[model samples]
Target chain A: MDQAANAAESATKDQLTQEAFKNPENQKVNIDANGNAIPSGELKDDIVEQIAQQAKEAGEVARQQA
Target chain B: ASITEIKADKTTAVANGQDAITYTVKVMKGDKPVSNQEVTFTTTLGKLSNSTEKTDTNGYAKVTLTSTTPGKSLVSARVSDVAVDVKAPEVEFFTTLTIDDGNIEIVGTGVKGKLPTVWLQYGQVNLKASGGNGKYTWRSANPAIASVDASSGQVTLKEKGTTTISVISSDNQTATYTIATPNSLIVPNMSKRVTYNDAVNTCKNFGGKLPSSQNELENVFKAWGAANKYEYYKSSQTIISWVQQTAQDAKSGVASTYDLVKQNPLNNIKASESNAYATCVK
Candidate 1:
């Protein structure tokens, strides 16, 4: 279960990054020349909603294994 | 041994893939070089030439980083208890703040007072910008006087006035240039049919010289409005105009003449110095 939880966390961060970049608002932000996007407060809420779903799905997977 | 100093040959590079930057990490133990120590690298952006390299006899490991994409990377060299970071950035994906090397500016013809000045009515000048994300957004402050292209820095002069032209790079660096369009240089009417020697003097009397070049003459014919096409000519009968060239420099008796069709029609005497014309520019 713990392994599944960690996997879910890693995937959540990865997905969050991918989503952050696709948000046009984030890409135009000149935070760094690094060309990576930083999520805004509004975007963070959107990401939170998506990660909550991932954790819920991961919990379901954990229950099935048990 | 631990990592002492980490550095890159150049901190930044244009993101063209061919421009490569060298990264190096110096490792030392106390006051002596730590030879034979393997340093591992963790870079977040561009492709690294070598991930793990052993320090040389003098204690430095070198690697090359090539970033083809418009992105940046943090290059970190690690050994035992020491970690050193040097930034090797690709300016391909750059911002105004990140642009260190190329100072954005306006460059092209008729640039005076560090600003581009258009000298004639209906005259055109090429305006190009240097140093940006390889792309630009050009704008004119006053389109009534001069207009500039948004993607290309082409300026078209409309009326006589002082205006501003601006360009913004894809990296968001906005640069502005003032453009001045004063009154056009007045060109007097063409002379009443004379010889090459007479034509040269006529222009001098008007305080102007013969059109410095053939192109200038043609353009002068343009600015001169229209000197009527003469009917009088040699056997075949073609229109000719006298420019500058007295007493056969091209020949002992040869001089320069131009018809609408040809520029280099070396004629000794088609009309024998009559009806041929020249104009003047102040």
Candidate 2:
């Protein structure tokens, strides 16, 4: 049952990650020397910060379970 | 005042649908042109441009005939309130107008496939045109595969191939139709309560094969079922082999029949089952 739950959670995570990357709002905007935003095909700062925070929380939860 | 004769510029005029043909009428009184005379024109099947016209100094008056219907029309002209020497004084002059059916459109209703796509070797199609008269000239691109009537737009397929049918009107307007035939022909089952083996033999007799797959069977059902409903058909596809030990409901009470459906294989029965239909394709 744990394995099945893990598989489902993993599938959801994969779906969410794919959707996050596909979203145009999550795309990176870089500032050039002329102060114009250039496309870099990377994640936005807010999304990167939110993902980092989520990873930190998950790591802490894993450490507690261990 | 006596009216001697009435003359028309043209005796007959062939016009396209919704088009006009002008006929000039001249009134004569005792071999002299009658000027300032009121001439009236009336049509039987179409509308006249002028119901009443005044003759010019040359004793000529013009009226146009226009009709959307494809048929014959008669335009009659006479001088109003004038006595005539002829027996029919009211009918001074008359013109026969022929209206052709308009632009041509083709449709294939006699074949398996819809318009533009007809079955090979024996498919037929119908042709139609609007606006012009009924007279038409028909031609076929490939006589071996398809042939059409010169006067009628009826097309007949001779062999398996593609061909084009062309129709031309008397007004010089032309229309072309393209049709093709597939490698095989799908025909509906006409018999009542047929067995699978019998269905296979029937298809073989017609140089065709039974539905070999679920997709093919479903396609045939959808195409033929929409036209002919209320008949559950049997396909060539057998769900299980007869070799496996199975009890038949009517015989041994195991497994008696194969898959059957109105369209799909939702309800299946035994091979020995009765009261089922079948379709064929070649």
Candidate 3:
């Protein structure tokens, strides 16, 4: 039963519903130029580039895994 | 007895009994034997299974092929995972405020103001009518991020983040600004209408008297007139007419005096040799 319960949790990991994805009220936090929470305007270039580079690195790692 | 040397050379298509049939495959080519690298075995049903062992110290990996669907299957080594950051979109608007000739002369009649331009970058949002009667509105893919007041023309940055700021007008016209700071500037796009008293009060508040000379008057006239698309007149007739007829009435006689006694001669005043208005108030 314990093993079965663990398997059930893992199986639900990728089973998100379409309605949850389409919800408009879902919002993300905004970061500032310093990668801090900002109350207004555009994000800082350093923060944006930093995030982008991190994403790229992650993708590279995943590709290597594949 | 179980097979001892169950291992074969790094070639697929092994010979079974009787008819020729391919079984499993494993191949490695390096100075060192590959070992401990995990490999996943998959079947035709796309179901995956792990059944492999790494070569000891040397660069060698080993895996046993389980009985799967009689078809082709691929095998490879696993890799490491990494982390990343995600962000939102940004929007911007430009100052298209104008004080010009045409309708500047006609205040309080309810007309369109100069159209400000708006733009967005990195992400997008749907334009929504907000507030009562939809008198104000804004576009925001993420309202919790940033938005602008369509009526008041005020942009409110919800949360600080990197984004492209774009100003868009009702006619779908657009302008953009790249902002990295939480700071924002409010630009007035609508023409400000002043009563005679208000105009005079403004002048007084700024430590100034009403335009004393034609040149001074022209500047004030042009400043306010340009917003409404009104052309500046070198002579006093047009302005005096505008002030007396419209702006003056709006003030309800709380404005500058109409010096009828000093006016007849002033009406015919001409532009001087310096292209200046010849009229002056005593």
Candidate 4:
């Protein structure tokens, strides 16, 4: 039972990170000096929300175990 | 009387420096040398060796002019209500120096006026000057540490060390900058029995925290695993809410525990056991 729960939590975090990288609003695309497109900026809001949600879910699972 | 012509030996001269040029004035009543006629030499930008002089046997009066300021100076030679303009070309004097780097800022140091001190990795920045006459020349104190382009004032760091870069403006004024490189990152390795709470506190003491995810744990292993003597490191993740399970076949009781490892899907273990060491990353 504990093993299955850990797997679910890990998978959820992975999915959240992947979705963050894919969202256009969460990225900034800029052009380099040679006129090449470079997408490097990160949206602060997206990362903050992702971490907050993960922490809340982890807390709930720990409480259930206790 | 009418002044015929005025000519200077050299078209250009330096401001407030060594070079002084001679200007000659020719005066005449008609077509003959107006000898002994007083010619008044005056300028707007500089001083004349002699403000007034008498024409010689060749109908010419000469004066040496020197300027301390930049721009053109009109030296007029007047006699008997006639005047001729002789242009004295004076170059600009260097006044200010500036350094440009995206991450670093240029600050003034009381007596030094304004300069810059930068700390960064291998990179380059630009240098510029204002209130100067013409071009600028740049130089580095140590080429092995840092190099500068004389024409462009572009500075490049070569190795780890502190060095100074200097720029000379057209009028001979100079400015310098100091550059420093930062030290590399060092990760710590602690070996001891670290429980879950102990692991958190230990990592915190090192200004870091335990690996929060599988990928982060793997990264730690790759960066320090070979150098580290420890086999396993603890992660921040946890698995709980365990319960007994009965087999379908004969009826047996088995319990499972979560084991978060570098690999994924948390391995199943005997219900009660601790199987990892402690590690931290900055």
- Residue-wise C-alpha lDDT for candidate 4, range B1-282, written one tens digit per residue: 656778788755566545677888787778777788887877876778998889898888888877777667777777845544444343232224444333331111111222223222223445554445557788999988777777877655455567787777655566666765433221223353233445455667766555554444433223323221222223322212122222411021112211222222221211122223344443
| lDDT (C-alpha) at residue A46 in model 2 | 48
**Candidate 4: which stretches are off by over 4 Å?**
A1-66, B1-5, B9-21, B26-35, B56-60, B67-69, B81-125, B134-144, B150-152, B159-282
* Cα lDDT of model 1 by residue, B28-136, tens digit: 8898999888888767777778888899999988987776665766777677445554443332334232222123222222232223231323334456565656678
**In model 3, what lDDT does residue B34 have?**
37
Worst lDDT window (10 residues) for model 4 chain B? B248-257
Predictions: Cα RMSD each: 41.2, 21.3, 39.6, 18.3
DockQ for each of the predicted structures, in order? 0.00, 0.01, 0.00, 0.02
The local distance difference test score of each candidate is 0.53, 0.49, 0.28, 0.50
Model 2 chain B lowest lDDT segment of ten: B236-245
**Highest lDDT scorer:** 1
Q: What is the DockQ of candidate 3?
A: 0.00
RMSD of 2: 21.3
- How well is each residue in B171-232 modelled by candidate 2, as lDDT tens digits? 45566767556565545454455555666667777766665555554543343333222112
User: How many residue pairs clash per model?
Assistant: 1, 20, 50, 0
Cα lDDT, model 2, residue A51: 60
Residue A29 in candidate 4 has what lDDT? 35
Residue pairs in candidate 1 whose N, alpha carbon or C atoms collide under 3 angstroms:
B70-B93
| Best of the candidates, TM-score | 2
Q: Could you give the CAPRI-style class of model 1?
A: incorrect
